[PDB]
Amino acid sequence: SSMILTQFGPFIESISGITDQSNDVFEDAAKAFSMFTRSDVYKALDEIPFSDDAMLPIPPTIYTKPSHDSYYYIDALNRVRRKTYQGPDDVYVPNCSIVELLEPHETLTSYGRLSEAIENRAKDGDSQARIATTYGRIAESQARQIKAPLEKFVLALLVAEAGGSLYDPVLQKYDEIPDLSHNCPLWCFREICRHISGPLPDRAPYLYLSAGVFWLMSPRMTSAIPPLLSDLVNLAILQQTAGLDPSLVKLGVQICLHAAASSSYSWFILKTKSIFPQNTLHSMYESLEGGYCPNLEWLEPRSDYKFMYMGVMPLSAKYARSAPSNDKKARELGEKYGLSSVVGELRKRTKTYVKHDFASVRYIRDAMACTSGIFLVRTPTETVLQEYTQSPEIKVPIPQKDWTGPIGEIRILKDTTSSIARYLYRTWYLAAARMAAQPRTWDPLFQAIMRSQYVTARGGSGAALRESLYAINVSLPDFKGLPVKAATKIFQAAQLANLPFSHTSVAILADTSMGLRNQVQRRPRSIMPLNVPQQQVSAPHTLTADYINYHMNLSPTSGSAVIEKVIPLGVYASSPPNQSINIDISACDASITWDFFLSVIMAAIHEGVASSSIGKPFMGVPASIVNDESVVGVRAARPISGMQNMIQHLSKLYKRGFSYRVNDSFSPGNDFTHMTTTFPSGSTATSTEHTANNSTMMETFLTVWGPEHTDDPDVLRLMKSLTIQRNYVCQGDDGLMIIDGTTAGKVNSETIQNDLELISKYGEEFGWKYDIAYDGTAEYLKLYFIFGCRIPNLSRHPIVGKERANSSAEEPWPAILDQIMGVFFNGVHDGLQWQRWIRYSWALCCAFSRQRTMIGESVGYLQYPMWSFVYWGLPLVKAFGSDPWIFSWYMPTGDLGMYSWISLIRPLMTRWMVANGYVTDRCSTVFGNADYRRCFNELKLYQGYYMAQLPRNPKKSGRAASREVREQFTQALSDYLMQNPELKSRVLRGRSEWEKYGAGIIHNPPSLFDVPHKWYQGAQEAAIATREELAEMDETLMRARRHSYSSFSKLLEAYLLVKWRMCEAREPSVDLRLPLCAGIDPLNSDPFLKMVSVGPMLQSTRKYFAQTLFMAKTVSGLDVNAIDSALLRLRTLGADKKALTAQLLMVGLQESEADALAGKIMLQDVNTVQLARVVNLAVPDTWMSLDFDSMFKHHVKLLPKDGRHLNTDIPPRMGWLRAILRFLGAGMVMTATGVAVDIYLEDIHGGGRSLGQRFMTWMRQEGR
RNA sequence: UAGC
Ligand SMILES: Nc1nc2c(ncn2[C@@H]2O[C@H](COP(=O)(O)OP(=O)(O)OP(=O)(O)O)C[C@H]2O)c(=O)[nH]1
Ligand SMILES: Nc1ccn([C@@H]2O[C@H](COP(=O)(O)OP(=O)(O)OP(=O)(O)O)C[C@H]2O)c(=O)n1
Ligand SMILES: [Mn+2]
Ligand SMILES: [Mn+2]
Structure with a gap:
């Protein structure tokens, strides 16, 4: 620490509240940070006198892995594919050796990239070489999922922590957060890395660069090291900043070591990601003696999501966990992944908490920050084949006899049908009629707004569109000579600006370009960038869904920020005597297909929109004539409105499916168009449309199906008291069923259990696999609640992680400062220890405030004064002779x-x-x-x-x-x-x-x-x-x-x-x-x-x-x-x-x-x-x-x-x-x-x- | 090529 103290001495004191802050010290620290070499951070780490409690057995198999070759193969379609061993999921990057496939770097001799020899052979067409390149490129990709080099985060941690315990201004005492010699993640990071570098002067296992990723030429390195180290750095920083319990933190390090120990880090992490949540959050209070929860009133109308605090609700045995025990499955999961040691320790501790209070919810929180924060990664080919493959199993199809003859592309659902689709068709017809009845709908401005929605600086499969049009001999303006990006729907808009709908109709059936998204604790998901014409024609669907969500159900239109996920609702739903069922539909996009939903929704809209749209165009689309075969025999032409003409064309696309064009830049030679019946996500209809079907089906259940399938007096009563307008909130495929409590206490657990099982069975009927959760917890939009207390899930906000689907390089320097600031605000919304968080953030910031600049041998330096960060939101620790920590975050x-x-x-x-x-x-x-x-x-x-x-x-x-x-x-x-x-x-x-x-x-x-x-x-x-x-x-x-x-x-x-x-x-x-x-x-x-x-x-x-x-x-x-x-x-x-x-x-x-x-x-x-x-x-x-x-x-x-x-x-x-x-x-x-x-x-x-x-x-x- |  003398190395760190000597170099950052004065600065360390300025951010620990011992001395005033000043730009001179700051910028000097910045310069010090800039001149610290990577290997020096490992040297700094060696100076640390780690305690035995900070150590734990590091699995030897983490260093010796097989060759990647046995983990891949070439399919009947010639595309490189991941070869399954642990099951259908085992499609991620496998844990293998990698040095054998590298060429030392010219200068950084101890580091290497993929042999250019291997790539050329791959580009030629050699199977073995393609396999190798793919594994090489994906393994690298897994390593890029971070904000900057790990050493910068570590260094800042060293600097910040060199300051020692911080004195609380309010509590008037120093905190008792263990120092670094007790930080278990850090010890592992040092030992794992030291063991890899071995006798090598270079101490970093890999280098996160711009020119790409480089691996240290050690026979001990593995494709699983980057993910592993990234996880340890996050835990290391949180144990110091979120004041996490060290004993729990070690539990999380173990899962990770077991992950690197397995055959596929990501796969493993994915299959066990519920260990902490299950053995803590979802198992709290099997016994309950005291504590207080909120007492909130939900004001009218409930749609406002407005609540009022009414004091506290004393807790007692009367409220102990009544939901079913997950013990059995929990222990099974632990047994199947060699983690029963951890699962058991978690169960044991969870049972010691018999009072609901600050201490126990902090324990849950702490437990959940230990889950891996890596953004799972796998090749595009695999995501597409695993996500656009499964089809819903409609256990009770809509009888063929229940459709009329054709009316263009659609068929009407005879009102004589006894199918449950009867009700799905009613809600959408009704909504459609009212939406098109509105005067505003026909206002030139509203239709302008709609038409501007999808005209964005984002993509829209521009190339496929240009060629679908070329197929009918229609060439679009190329505006040769303009300094704008051509792959923007904005560019698309300009090329179509002066073309009749009849000439661009074919584009509605153009292919769809590939677009992907990596997530933390989840599998990557593919996306569909629809083109302007396709988005245009989707309007009727989108508007009718909006009309439903605004007028017929209790729903939210939230973003991704915690500030917009309606926290008040979770406090209410999870506060005894209230209870909630966390509903979710798995494989949602694959579940909305033509056979049941779409063919019925289209018909519903098309017919409920008839009288008000009659004789009128809509958003550019003209009215037209279509063939009619409704009635038997009777076959005439029917004048349909522009609005109907849209459904007509959209129905054609929903029926054929989507031609997903897959250009897998990671798997050489994996170019292919895949047709899928999965619903499009990049559609302006997507979100709103899923929210509407969600509530519609739930309404139909509670109102019709449910009551008809059971005579259980209680279940019928519980059901009758539930309305989608008062008790069911939802967004997309997410649902929160809120069962209000009484004075007699909460509703019987067994009656709720019966209800749920009917919902599960009800869904199989139309191809919906409901993922219902009844565990005493409230979970909506990845917000976790219990007894009125919100539990931040820190694992979902990796401090070093960053999603990177594409191969493109990171944004030039300045850009990282916005990312660093976002890291700070997260820590605020997530409740980290304020002083520890603020101090570390100052360390992190100083460490990214200086950049080397070039102007042609004009080597200068860009430096942001400490003051710029204040402007951005970071509070001062102590300035102008003030007392320390007077400024709040x-x-x-x-x-x-x-x-x-x-x-x-x-x-x-x-x-x-x-x-x-x-x-x-x-x-x-x-x-x-x-x-x-x-x-x-x-x-x-x-x-x-x-x-x-x-x-x-x-x-x-x-x-x-x-x-x-x-x-x-x-x-x-x-x-x-x-x-x-x-x-x-x-x-x-x-x-x-x-x-x-x-x-x-x-x-x-x-x-x-x-x-x-x-x-x-x-x-x-x-x-x-x-x-x-x-x-x-x-x-x-x-x-x-x-x-x-x-x-x-x-x-x-x-x-x-x-x-x-x-x-x-x-x-x-x-x-x-x-x-x-x-x-x-x-x-x-x-x-x-x-x-x-x-x-x-x-x-x-x-x-x-x-x-x-x-x-x-x-x-x-x-x-x-x-x-x-x-x-x-x-x-x-x-x-x-x-x-x-x-x-x-x-x-x-x-x-x-x-x-x-x-x-x-x-x-x-x-x-x-x-x-x-x-x-x-x-x-x-x-x-x-x-x-x-x-x-x-x-x-x-x-x-x-x-x-x-x-x-x-x-x-x-x-x-x-x-x-x-x-x-x-x-x-x-x-x-x-x-x-x-x-x-x-x-x-x-x-x-x-x-x-x-x-x-x-x-x-x-x-x-x- | 990288959506709402
Ligand atoms: N339309 C749309 N919906 C999104 C997007 N991201 C998330 N959602 C919706 O909000 C839901 C919550 O999604 P998550 O992917 O867990 O994002 P998050 O909310 O930021 O998670 P975190 O707790 O870590 O902050 C899922 C989905 O229905 C997006 O880019 N577009
Ligand atoms: N960037 C994103 C992320 C999600 N979604 C939409 O959110 C909807 C459902 O959310 P998830 O629960 O996150 O997706 P699922 O496919 O249902 O995940 P799985 O069953 O594990 O839950 C469907 C999807 O199109 C989206 O449009 N854009
Ligand atoms: Mn889902
Ligand atoms: Mn969901």
């Missing part, structure tokens, strides 16, 4: 965050500056007699501040674009969007109108006329950048670093004029004995105190924020939040109604609607969150789990604590000020470590009137 981001920490130590800063020579005669309103201008330039605070706001990736704009083709393109884009003359006309009105009532007031008028321009830029920025464009980006960051400044942003200089008074601590909003999120307990002071004082966010953030906008959606390309800002800004700038009416017309609204909304906007009382956008203030993501709405409303007093002040009074017409002011008060409160306090407006320098004009100036100047 809930500190806002950007300007709002800068204002907050600076406001919290204004005096401190001023005093410090003066005491160091930065004195002046001019008294600053904010910093008194401090020479802040000279100070902030010298500390690189201004520099860091501005550098933070610069693009972290190369810009492609500015590439030479021959004006003429440049105009042809944006024209086609325009035509696509401006298909319907009525819409264009709407915008032209908005324009001439704008020139009379709005032009001049603001300068950001959003307009549909901009979209074509934004679309072009998007297609541009999607293209690969040049080394030149890369040099330009550096120069930019480096120019801002040289430049010196005299102020911050106009907005921030305004916030600084506002002073506050921090007061008495708030009272608890929830019981302090109440577990809400494992990890957030009295051992994690700041996160905890904030949780208790501020309160948890009990409403769905998606539903909440949807209430802060006048318009939900707009044409893709424009920003709903932008539009909201312009309208409110015009109003604040005193613009006339007519002016707002003009803006709305420029974005697509019909005058009637425009004038109505404009008039409505004018008189509304806009809420804090919505109003604060006029000045670009946004609720920090980190705050999303807290009740920020209460804070704004009841704990940020704008009335000075001691009465009215002249400066504090708010001018009549400047009420909007109060909203901006609220964000500033909360910003300081949330940034201050400890309990939320009540902050009181103390002062506004030039007064509120001056402040308002100041903000108005910024407003009217945006975009000039």
Whole structure:
């Protein structure tokens, strides 16, 4: 550690709260990090005096593996294939030797890549060589699934931990987290690597580079080492940052060692990934004595996902685990994978927890962070053959006699059918009828929005489309000479802009390009990038599904972020006396096929949409005539609407299937088109469509099937009390059945058990394998709940992992900084120990803040000041002589965050500056007699501040674009969007109108006329950048670093004029004995105190924020939040109604609607969150789990604590000020470590009137 | 070639 201490000494102290932070120390540490060689990190690791408790037997078979050759073969189709040994799954990268297939590197002599000799032979066609290349390429691919070299994460850990225990400001004592000599993962990482390198000077087992991956030329290396080491690094860091229990951590190291020990690391990891969850989470409290769980009320209407805390629910034996015991299967699983030692130890400990509290949920949490975090990987060929193969087993087919004759491509489900499809057809027909009945549906704007949905900078199988068209002799414009990426649906849009639907129809049957996705703890999944025509024709399906989800069921449309997965619902569902069944349908996409679902859905839509769409086109598609054979004998032609014409063509595609074109870059010679009946995932229908069928079938069960298949009085009662509108929440193939409890306690376990079994049997009837889980736990959208307590699953957020499906290289340097920051926020949302996490993050950041730059022998260095990270969100540990750890990780981001920490130590800063020579005669309103201008330039605070706001990736704009083709393109884009003359006309009105009532007031008028321009830029920025464009980006960051400044942003200089008074601590909003999120307990002071004082966010953030906008959606390309800002800004700038009416017309609204909304906007009382956008203030993501709405409303007093002040009074017409002011008060409160306090407006320098004009100036100047 |  002397090697680490000597080199990072001062820095270590600055991030441990012993000494102040400063850019000089920081940048020097950065330079030290940059000059540490890989092998030096292993040397540093050797200096560590590991304890015996940190050691465990390392399996010798981890080093001696067979040849890859016996693990592959060539099939009847000549494609290289993985040869199965452990079962159908055994398709991943096998654990084998690899050195025998390498050629030493020219320079890094001890490292090697795949023999170029082997590849050429493979490219020739040699079977043995192909096998070898494939294994070589996939093994490498498995190794690329990480953010950067493992040594950087390790080094930062060394630096951070060299600081020793941290003193808690609140608890007023040092934490007791074991030091590194007790870190078992680290010991393994060192020993495993040392054993491989052996007598070699190079200590790294492999090198993660740009030129690819290189293996250390040791006969001891294995294709399983990269995954293994990556797993150990994650555990190593968490044992120190999440305060994980070391005894548990060793259990996780064992599974991993067993994984590398097996014949296929990934396969093994996959087959055992439920060990920790099963022997802890899903087995808690078989016995229960005490503890408290939340008591929540689900407000009406349940669709709002809005809840209210009502105190605590005392627990007792009355609530012990009633769900079936998983013991048997659990022990079996352990026995089958040689892990019965671990499974047993876990069962033993789980039984010792007889009280529900912080301690026990922390144990579950700790247990679950130990699961491997690797992104499983296998060759494309295999994913495609394993995912587009299985077909649903419809145990009860829809009788052939139940269909009418054809009506084009569809057949009507006779209403005489006794098939369960009867009800599936009803829901969709009904929905379709109501959707097409809506006036909005026929509005030129809505149809424009729809048509813009799939016009994105993403792929759409462009090549296959261009050739399907060529087959009918139709050539698309090539826009030869444009600097935009051609494989964008945006490019596609332009090529089709001026072509009749009848000419592009054939494209609906074009092939589909390959697209893949690797996931943590899951198998890779293939994706279907549908083309514009295919997406167009899919509309009716998508809209009818949306109509169902919005009006007929209880469903969520969530993303991937924890902030949007409705946490409140899980707390409710899992709190006794409530119970929940976690439903999931396995092989969902393979389950939605023509034979049952699609052939019925198409018919339903096509018929329920008939009368309202009659005699009308839709989204570009024309009406037409189709052959009719419904009735027997009677065979005529039928006039169908454009909307119907879509279903007509879509039905044709759903019937034929999809031609998945597989170009496997990992398996030489594996080129082939595979036809599959699996449902498309890249379809705009996918998600919404699966959510609708889900709830529809559940409705049919509870309402029809169920009741008809059982006379059990209780099961019938339980069922009757369940409605899909109140008790069943779902998204996609995920379902959460919430059985509310009574005063008599919870519903009988045996009656629930009976119910479930009927659901299972019910699904076999239409080819759906329900994966039902009834274990006392609530699990929805990978969010884990128990007794009202949310259990973060850390294993799913690998600190070093990163998905990399394609062979393409990682993004140039700067890019990694955004990834590092994301790692930090995860740690916040996941509840890691705040001080330990913040310190490590500073280590990690410093370690990635410097990059070597080239300009042609002009070897300089790019360096981000420590201040840039603050701008990005990382809280300061100690600065300007302040006390240590006064800043919380809930500190806002950007300007709002800068204002907050600076406001919290204004005096401190001023005093410090003066005491160091930065004195002046001019008294600053904010910093008194401090020479802040000279100070902030010298500390690189201004520099860091501005550098933070610069693009972290190369810009492609500015590439030479021959004006003429440049105009042809944006024209086609325009035509696509401006298909319907009525819409264009709407915008032209908005324009001439704008020139009379709005032009001049603001300068950001959003307009549909901009979209074509934004679309072009998007297609541009999607293209690969040049080394030149890369040099330009550096120069930019480096120019801002040289430049010196005299102020911050106009907005921030305004916030600084506002002073506050921090007061008495708030009272608890929830019981302090109440577990809400494992990890957030009295051992994690700041996160905890904030949780208790501020309160948890009990409403769905998606539903909440949807209430802060006048318009939900707009044409893709424009920003709903932008539009909201312009309208409110015009109003604040005193613009006339007519002016707002003009803006709305420029974005697509019909005058009637425009004038109505404009008039409505004018008189509304806009809420804090919505109003604060006029000045670009946004609720920090980190705050999303807290009740920020209460804070704004009841704990940020704008009335000075001691009465009215002249400066504090708010001018009549400047009420909007109060909203901006609220964000500033909360910003300081949330940034201050400890309990939320009540902050009181103390002062506004030039007064509120001056402040308002100041903000108005910024407003009217945006975009000039 | 890399989707919603
Ligand atoms: N349409 C669509 N749905 C997605 C996507 N990613 C996830 N989902 C949906 O949300 C669900 C949760 O998926 P996961 O893949 O577990 O993502 P995650 O939510 O980020 O998991 P984590 O807990 O580790 O943060 C599965 C699926 O129905 C995506 O890219 N597109
Ligand atoms: N990047 C992703 C990931 C998932 N999905 C969609 O999510 C849906 C179901 O989610 P999973 O449960 O994750 O997929 P399954 O195929 O059902 O997994 P398996 O039975 O193990 O659960 C189907 C799939 O198309 C998607 O469109 N895009
Ligand atoms: Mn599933
Ligand atoms: Mn699912």
